[PDB]
Amino acid sequence: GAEFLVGRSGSGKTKLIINSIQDELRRAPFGKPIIFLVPDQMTFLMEYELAKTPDMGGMIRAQVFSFSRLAWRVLQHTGGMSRPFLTST
Amino acid sequence: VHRLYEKELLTEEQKDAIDIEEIVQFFHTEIGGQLIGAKWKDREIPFSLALPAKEIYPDAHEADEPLLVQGIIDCLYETEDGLYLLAYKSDRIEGGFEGAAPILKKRYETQIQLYTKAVEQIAKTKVKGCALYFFDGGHILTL
Amino acid sequence: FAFDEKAREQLSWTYPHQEVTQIRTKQSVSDEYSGR
Amino acid sequence: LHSEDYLTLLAEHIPLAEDIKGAHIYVDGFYQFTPQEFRVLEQLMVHAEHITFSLTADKPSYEREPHELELFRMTGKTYYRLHQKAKELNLDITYKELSGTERHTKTPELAHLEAQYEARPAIPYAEKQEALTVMQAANRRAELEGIAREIHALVREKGYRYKDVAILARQPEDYKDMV
Known part of the structure; x- marks a missing residue:
């Protein structure tokens, strides 16, 4: 399953992501791995x-x-x- | 050990350096068998724990901003009793172990607390009992 | 002088959070952004 | 092994890494990807249960690649490519478009710059100057020294913290020593 989150700069993409991972951490602390891939x-x-x-x-x-x-x-x-x-070198 | 060598998780030197007796010895211990028999298990568990700055640095008491302590819990396993923590240490011992235990205990004392804290605070569960296995003589002490 | 009061404050001013400005954010217990 | 060998090694080792199966993945902060990094993402799209791609753009299309002169060329082009791969891979796709401003809700002028940056038929800002300011200095020395004073005004007067200020330069090599 692939999800495309798109929006202009300062639209809150990253904020939405962080929060989602946090609730996921809240709901199932030992659940399946969550990989946050950034530069x-x-x-x-x-x-x-x-x-x-x-x-x-x-x-x-x-x-x-x-x-x-x-x-x-x-x-x-x-x-x-x-x-x-x-x-x- | 050989498969780790094939898949290149181990250097030729590293391979020849492993004392198998000291590796199998753990799984014959009370802790080892308890690890084997468990509803759930995981190893090499990474974590990031946010602590108030002073809780680590007593020197600077003024500010409460959180800092990140990061490490890897060697092993965790759950039984019908509770969740237990497991760490292996290649520490130098025999050269009794009765007299080393007190010293080892507080060489890794602060570290294990951080672990339990990391688990208890983040997972909102609780860690009952911590064990450290030692390759030198295959020793085990509980915290 | 007109600015007699402001000046004296700004010269006596300190940074409320200054004690933390030197502390490393990430600290490893065993990545170039952390320390030990 | 080559510094740039790990990514190819990763891409081919992903399939037999079983802990990344049932794993939820988020990618963010990337404007574009290299073919090598690409190989990794599509290998993640296959073996991961969920993957979300965050791209900074404006209603990109997956049929056409962005024209040369449009602002979201890079991110749009990456969206089209990531979407065509997810299409050929037969993945369940979902979309989320963020419309409103989040960062600039309390700053109209900065909100204006972000929206009116592109369109050449651009409308001038009809309100007061506060958040946005251009400034000229006698030289890089005075430039930093002037900015240094500004930062102090911000922390000492306006109640900011040092961690809230960020200074950027296209050629940091020009200011690095003086900073």
Whole structure:
């Protein structure tokens, strides 16, 4: 199932998202994984907001991923992480 | 261990360094069997917990803004009794374990509390009992 | 002078939340935005 | 392994990662995607139970790609592509359009800039100046130094906090040292 949330800048897309994940955290704290996929520079911003609730003040079911951390996660399970990494240099 | 090697979750060196006896030893313990038998289980559980700034930094008492403590709970499992926390530690012990326990207890003391807090506050459930397994001699202490 | 009062306040002014401005937001217990 | 090898590795490892099945996924903050990142998203669309795509645009179309000169070229083009993939993948699709302003409800002028940014047949703002101001400085030194005073006026007078202010530059390399 795919959902397309579209709107101009400052229409509240992100706010709607954060809140939805929070209620999902409220209703089923140990439920199936919730993956919040944002750009690399948006991760720590989302981690701070998500956790910002009177009710919970944090999260376990939901996680904030950049494509890299998401990849790193899945790979620490499915495999490939012990393969030596090469720097651009 | 070999499959982890095949799938490259382990380096050749890491593979040859594993003491299997110390890995199987856990599943023969009271805790191990309890882990095996459980309605529900999960491992490598990431979490983000928001705490008042001073609750960590006693030094700065003035402001109550929340800061994020983030970690990974090694293991959690639920039984008909309650939810239990599980962490494995490669800590150096035998070199009795009776005398190390008091020291180990408070080396990981603050850490485990953060965990229980993370779970209890976020999940709004409660953690009854915490266990730490030690590869050196296969030791277990409860918190 | 006209501004005698404002000036003295602004020079004695501090930042109410200043104690926190140096504290790291994310702190890991074991990502470049956190600390230990 | 290559810095840019993880994404291809991820895309092909997603199918056999069973904890991402029944997982709810939200993507946000992206204007566009690379083919490689794309490979990941469509692999997520397959194995994830729910995925929501948040894109900043204005009633984009999935039949036609945005013309060269329209504002939401990037985001519109990504919407059309993400939608055509969800169509060929036979996914249950749902839409949500956000119409009203949320960020600028109490700031008419900023609300004006956002809405009238595009249309060249643009209507002038007919009200008072308060929230929006352009300013000229003798040089980058005075520019930052002037802005520094403004920030203090904001925190000391108008009751803002430092965390509420954000300063941007197209070429941070020009102000970085002086900042």
